[PDB]
């Protein structure tokens, strides 16, 4: 379970690169292309299938981090249109972060924000390159 593994990360008992940050699998065989942390092959398969899929509202269908989610926050940046589920945000940014972001208006997401690091959520400095290779 992702919850406990992230706990360990915060406790500096485990490196975030050694966990799948999308599902919590320990069978990491590759790097998450957008954020610092590991990724399992299942989630890669999910990512390849779900990434940049869009709903009829003009925003992405699934959480950028986990390619899933039930309630998601949508980026206001029209050049972006990404979304992030409440669970990944509270888990990786930190407890309360989702509620904090929901009250923000306008809200620009973690793939837009210049700071690039939000709690344990760290955007890769080279994610376009990573992405491009992820896809190939």
């Amino acid at each position: 379970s992702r919850e406990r593994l992230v706990y360990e990360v915060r406790q500096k008992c485990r490196n975030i690169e050694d966990i799948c940050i999308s599902c919590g699998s320990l069978n990491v065989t590759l790097e998450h292309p957008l954020f610092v942390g590991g990724m399992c092959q299942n989630c890669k398969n999910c990512f390849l299938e779900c990434a940049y899929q869009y709903d009829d509202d003009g925003y992405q269908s699934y959480c950028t981090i986990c390619c899933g989610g039930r309630e998601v926050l949508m980026c206001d940046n029209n050049n972006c249109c990404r979304c992030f589920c409440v669970e990944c945000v509270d888990l990786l940014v930190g407890p309360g972060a989702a509620q904090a972001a929901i009250k923000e208006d306008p809200w620009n997401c973690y793939m837009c924000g210049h700071k690039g690091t939000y709690g344990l959520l760290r955007r890769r400095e080279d994610w376009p390159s990573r992405l491009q290779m992820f896809f190939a």
Binding site: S61, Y62, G68, E71, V72, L73, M74, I102
Partner: peptide
């Protein structure tokens, strides 16, 4: 932030 429930 706007929110929605995922499909």
């Amino acid at each position: 932030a706007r929110t929605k429930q995922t499909a």
